[PDB]
Amino acid sequence: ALSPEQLVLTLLEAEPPHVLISRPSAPFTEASMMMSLTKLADKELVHMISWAKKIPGFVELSLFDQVRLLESCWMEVLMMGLMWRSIDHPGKLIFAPDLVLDRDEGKCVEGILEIFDMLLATTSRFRELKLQHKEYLCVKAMILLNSKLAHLLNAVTDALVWVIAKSGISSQQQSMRLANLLMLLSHVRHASNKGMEHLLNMKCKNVVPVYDLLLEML
């Protein structure tokens, strides 16, 4: 068994690497922007599996549980990571170190402009709250486990509480900060739902050729 410190520290040493994607030479078309994002998601999904396997206890579940959790959460975790990379750059989504899209660049893909404003809105809420790197670690792990499981999901919740307690703010502000962060999960789940409907629609029209692991998660 682990303590809240060791749990947070294990989550710290399990962080996935930043996937590198570059803007294409030609100007962005709806099919090309969809190509860049789906390639980015396909590569990020490989490292998420490695990250999810490092969550304490995750490999102890039945295979069907590990599968079902990743099928339902994988999008929410990708947008949550995206909003953390974009937390210090308003009006911008840091999809990759060399893929920084301004908001109005979404006006090229049909339907994506409404989804971009959602992530930018949720990012701003996380920025106004001054989300800490240690809290972000617990939230991402909680997104996975909220898609033995009750014990693991309670352990991460215990760790997040322990992080808020280490800030020294009043006991009300600790319960208040906890509730404020927990409610943004609904906005993240909402972005995942609206974002998934857009991708499946893009897939059936054969707008973007998805492949392999991104294909299989669909």
Binding site: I49, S50, K53, L63, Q66, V67, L70, L213, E216, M217
Partner: peptide, 11 residues
Amino acid sequence: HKILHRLLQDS
């Protein structure tokens, strides 16, 4: 489920 099962069982 080809790759996911493989990825969950490797290192």
